[PDB]
Amino acid sequence: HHHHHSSGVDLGFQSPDTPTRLVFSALGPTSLKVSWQEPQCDRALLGYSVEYQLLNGGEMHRLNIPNPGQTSVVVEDLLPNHSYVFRVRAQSQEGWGREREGVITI
């Protein structure tokens, strides 16, 4: 099978760089804005993937962010006083850059 990006471009080397430190901003008691800086790449970025989970284990949630210009996402329904790990990496046509990890206690 041939997998394509959400934008339609075909997938499949100089990888994207790693994003800088993740910035977290609370929007209420259970909602969190996660922001980063677009990393450099010789090629066009297609977007980002954001994965997060409780540090102590739990279901891994994954979000695909299909705009290279979209460098933030708001996550909802988080558990107060629980610690999470977020990992963000940039995607190009040729593959994935390395992940930037950031952790936070809600």
Question: Taking the domains of the chain in order of start, what are their residue ranges?
Answer: 1-106
Q: What is the resolution of this structure in A?
A: 1.6
Q: Is 20 exposed, middle or buried (0-12, 13-18, 19+ CB in 10 A)?
A: exposed
CB-based contacts of 44, cutoff 8 Å, min separation 6: 68, 92, 93
CATH of 1-106, one of 2.40.50.140, 3.10.310.10, 3.20.20.140, 2.60.40.10: 2.60.40.10
Contact 73, 34 (CB under 8 A): yes
Contact 85, 55 (CB under 8 A): yes
Experimental technique for the deposited model = X-ray
